[PDB]
Amino acid sequence: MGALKPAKAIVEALLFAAGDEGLSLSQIAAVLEVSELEAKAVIEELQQDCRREERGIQLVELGGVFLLATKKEHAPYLKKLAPGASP
Amino acid sequence: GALKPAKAIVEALLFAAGDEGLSLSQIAAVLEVSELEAKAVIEELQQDCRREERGIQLVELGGVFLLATKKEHAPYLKKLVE
């Protein structure tokens, strides 16, 4: 009943599969077949959603791509457990 | 919201583990909680992922838990390899 909910879920899935290389605004917008402005707004909402305390993945931006990464507050736990790293 | 950060820890852990996932014991061990506790938390995160706005699901296969994409979004993931 939220018109961009499936759009938002697709963006999450894409970034999830994209992995540590991530995806650019353009790449994301082309897959969804929406404008870049529309895509940005969706990405932003997802980024907001991830900022919630109960969420352990966040949507970061660097090197011209969006990508999913863990929150720094959780590192002590993740260290008890390859993987790919961003510091 | 007393288990929010715990659920966040589980999400973070499963996300980093990849497609090989983690058993209940590993999760319970990292969180330093009982297996029964870990299970309650894993199940709640599973319920959260089943909402339509989430693009990932949590599943149990071969006695491990893992995150994966929902297969209803497959046609967009094809459109990514291309």
């Binding site: 992995g19 290389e21 999913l68 990464a69 863990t70 993987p83 790293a85 | 990849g18 390899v81």
Partner: peptide, 15 residues
Amino acid sequence: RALLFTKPPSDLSAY
């Protein structure tokens, strides 16, 4: 050194 973990790309597969 603030650690953020990423995960590798998924099953590129056929799709």
